Amino acid sequence: LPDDAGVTAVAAFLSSAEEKSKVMQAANWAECAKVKGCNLSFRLVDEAVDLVCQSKAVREYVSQANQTQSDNAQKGICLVTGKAAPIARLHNAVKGVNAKPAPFASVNLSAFESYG
RNA sequence: GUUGAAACAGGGUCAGCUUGCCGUAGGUGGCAUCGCCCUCGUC
DSSP: OOSOSSHHHHHHHTTOSSHHHHHHTSTTHHHHTTSTTOOOOOOOTTTSSOOGGGSTTHHHHHHHHTTSGGGSSOOOOOSSSOSOOOOOSSOOOBOSSSSSOBOSSOOOSTTTOSOO
């Protein structure tokens, strides 16, 4: 995804090792270090509300990286909709129930698995 | 006899410790059993 100026910016910020060091020397960095599992994200300036992961190329990339990579998986068949719709192992971490986002529907122990 | 099987609520933890129902208060004050009535009549 080149010529974005949002990800070329961060890819030039993630090939820096010093500006990232400058992130620790920020006014409020001491308050993000307090929260375990802080989630930083990359809003390039000159978009002003829009993250690097909000530009209409990363937006399309994700809409392309959730339409190509998450479509070659196990071909069928949906429990929910019944369509072919490639099957999703690893249901996504439903947040707000547990102490951590937990996979609402998740059969992961040696025998909760039914038929192998 | 090819098709959800197997599966714990467990193990256990004094509700204890303790705390006057009390101090205290007239049943009083007061009120006629009265007014009255042949044991008679008589052998």
